[PDB]
């Protein structure tokens, strides 16, 4: 037992996350970098009062009310369009550890691109969701789907409550329920489409939703589609969580003061940006104190946390029977496509009836079901459950390694996602080109998907990354962080 | 996303030094006088804080709220509309300090009273909280 601090949140292990506040001198220089950039945008759009070539709205028989706001497209053409060479690069291989990248360039200053012919090979990637290393066209794991592909085909032309319902679908929905250790489970077509089609089938008009500051575009969208009051609490702030949670019961609606119909909470396991784990036992202890429900999102967390990785519940060692509904995907540890919902059998049956997607959308393709099954078989017991001990070794090694190198890292230390802090917007545009010169492709995260002084880069660790693959990348970063002086930390 | 843009870290510190640069730029002009430097810098500041707060409406990016604040200028949309916040009051105190130093300089003249007041007038008038959404015959 480690911490039982105030809310009854019982901790087994030390927690050890790190949110180092940004330095004073660093932050001021950022606004200057945007300030010069917002200056030329008004300059550039003023120059466009006569005629880098544009999409040119049809003149032929048109010119109604214009389609777009000119001003809402400001940042996409004056900060994005300048440096959009990165995070869009086509690859032409299996996204494993080394990735063949088609080379492209623009003499029109990123306004129109061009492939030369080039295939930049053996590029170490750190920007793919390939945690347990199942992206390979080799081995017996993917080979089993080839038997399924030559037999079944590549997609039902039907719906789940309609004709299309294969035995594999019935098999997989069983298989995850034993994997999660819950009663029943149900797979969906893609992980985005799960939250945007099932959360509106749960909450209704008189409900209240307590979601985090930074969930996803999934979880917000499902909360918009269900007409329901949405309230935001601060990120991993149980005190700010309980403060809303207190006032949610001792008040009701704003207009009437009737009680709420039901309330629930939308939280994720591992937040993708600023890779951090939610203070989960302080949430389980608090929802029992206030009779709220809980929607949990193991999109990143499953296959990455716990021994023989089974999401954050085994990582906190807790029970699956206190989380009211569990959701995760198959794209981000399994090398597949789609997502599930785990929950009680009463819940699943209600969602086998009121689904928005089992009744309208077509279901999974048959061979990618097999890729999910054989991957879970290698986990449940052949590149199997030894790689999660490898990745946690790779996580814990790489996390201390950049921290002692003077870089600044967010999130919990055991989190495989490595948020690396840039601050200047030019340092965004240089860094993606700079690492690509040093035979490594990474993911940089721009301004509007962050706050202003975050503008970070992000690393996805992998169990497929060995030590020599990892240390070679450590050598390349040591030069670049020197070259751009991005050694912001004091320690 | 324009609701936490003045609620950020060190934006207050950087807002000063932009004006502090703008004065030292305006201080090193040959055919100018040390009163009308202060007269100039109180006019330009209150010109910027009208055009960048009370004229342009919407976001430079695209809002996932389906354009709720498309008809709302930047002052109206700070902190999701709650007026008496920690950062709007900083934005109201600062032109007054820029009014009093330009009161101190130019030696309290009559034309430097007239020209430097209506700039300070026309910037605080929209910052009345009971003038939240009323727009005078336009915009």
């Amino acid at each position: 037992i480690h911490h039982v601090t105030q809310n009854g949140g019982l901790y087994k292990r030390p927690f050890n996350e790190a949110f180092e506040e940004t330095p004073m001198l660093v932050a001021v220089l950022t606004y200057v970098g945007y300030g010069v950039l917002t200056l030329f945008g008004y300059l550039r759009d003023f120059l466009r009062y006569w005629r880098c070539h544009h999409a040119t709205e049809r003149e032929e028989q048109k010119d109604f009310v214009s389609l777009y706001q000119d001003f809402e497209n400001f940042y996409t053409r004056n900060l994005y369009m300048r440096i959009r060479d990165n995070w869009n690069r086509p690859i032409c291989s299996v996204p494993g550890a080394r990735v063949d990248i088609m080379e492209r360039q623009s003499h029109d200053y990123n306004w129109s691109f061009k492939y030369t012919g080039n295939i930049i090979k053996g590029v170490i990637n750190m920007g793919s969701y390939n945690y347990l290393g199942f992206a390979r066209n080799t081995g017996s794991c993917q080979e089993a789907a080839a038997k399924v592909l030559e037999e079944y085909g590549a997609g039902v032309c039907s719906t789940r409550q309609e004709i299309g319902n294969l035995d594999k679908h019935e098999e997989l929905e069983e298989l995850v329920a034993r994997f999660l250790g819950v009663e029943a489970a149900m797979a969906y077509g893609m992980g985005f489409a799960t939250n945007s089609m099932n959360i509106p089938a749960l909450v209704g008009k008189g409900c209240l939703i307590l979601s985090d500051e930074l969930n996803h575009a999934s979880l917000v969208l499902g909360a918009r589609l269900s007409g329901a009051t949405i309230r935001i609490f601060k990120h991993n702030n149980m005190q700010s969580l309980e403060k809303l949670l207190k006032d949610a019961i001792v008040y009701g609606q704003p207009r009437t003061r009737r009680p709420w119909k039901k309330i629930l909470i939308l939280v994720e396991g591992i937040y993708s940006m600023e890779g951090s784990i939610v203070r989960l036992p302080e949430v389980i202890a608090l929802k029992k104190k206030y009779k709220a429900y809980l929607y949990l999102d193991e999109a990143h967390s499953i296959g990455a946390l716990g021994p023989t990785g089974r999401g954050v519940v085994e990582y906190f060692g807790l029970d699956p029977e206190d989380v009211d509904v569990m959701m995760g995907t198959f794209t981000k540890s399994f090398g597949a496509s789609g997502g599930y919902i785990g929950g009680k059998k009463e819940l699943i049956d209600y969602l086998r009836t009121h689904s928005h997607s089992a009744v309208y959308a077509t279901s999974l393709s048959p061979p990618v079901v097999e890729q999910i099954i054989t991957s879970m078989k290698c986990i449940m017991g052949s590149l199997g459950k030894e790689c999660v001990q490898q990745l946690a070794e790779n996580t814990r090694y790489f996390r201390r390694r950049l921290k002692e190198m003077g870089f600044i890292i967010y999130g919990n230390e055991d989190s495989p996602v490595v948020p690396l802090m840039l601050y200047m917007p030019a340092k965004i545009g240089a860094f993606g080109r700079e690492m690509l010169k040093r035979n490594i492709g990474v993911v940089v995260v721009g301004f509007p998907a962050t706050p202003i002084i975050e503008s970070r880069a992000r690393f996805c660790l992998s169990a497929a990354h060995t030590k020599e693959i990892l240390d070679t990348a450590l050598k390349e970063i040591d030069e670049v962080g020197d070259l751009l002086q991005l050694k912001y930390s004091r320690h | 996303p324009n609701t936490r843009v003045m609620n950020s870290r060190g934006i207050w510190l950087s807002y000063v030094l932009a004006i502090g640069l703008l004065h030292i730029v305006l201080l090193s002009i040959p055919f100018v006088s040390v009163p009308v430097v202060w007269t100039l810098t109180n006019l330009i500041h209150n010109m910027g804080m009208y055009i960048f707060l009370h004229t342009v409406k919407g976001t430079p990016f695209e809002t996932p709220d389906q354009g709720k604040a498309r008809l709302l200028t930047h002052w109206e949309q700070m902190d999701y509309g709650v007026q008496f916040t920690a950062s709007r009051k900083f934005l109201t105190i600062t032109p007054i300090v820029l009014y009093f130093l330009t009161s101190f300089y130019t030696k309290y003249d009559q034309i430097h009273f007239v020209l430097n007041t209506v700039s300070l007038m026309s910037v605080l008038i929209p910052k009345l909280p009971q003038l939240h959404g009323v727009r005078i015959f336009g915009i």
């Binding site: - | 008496f84 105190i93 009093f100």
Partner: peptide, 29 residues
């Protein structure tokens, strides 16, 4: 020095404006 005529009248309005302005603390069938 020590007085402009109708200006320390107007300046006294502004310095008294801040004191009300400093303590309001909040805002908005």
């Amino acid at each position: 020095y020590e007085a402009p005529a109708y200006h320390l009248i107007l300046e006294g309005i502004l310095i008294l404006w801040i004191i009300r302005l400093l303590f309001s603390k909040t805002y908005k069938t």
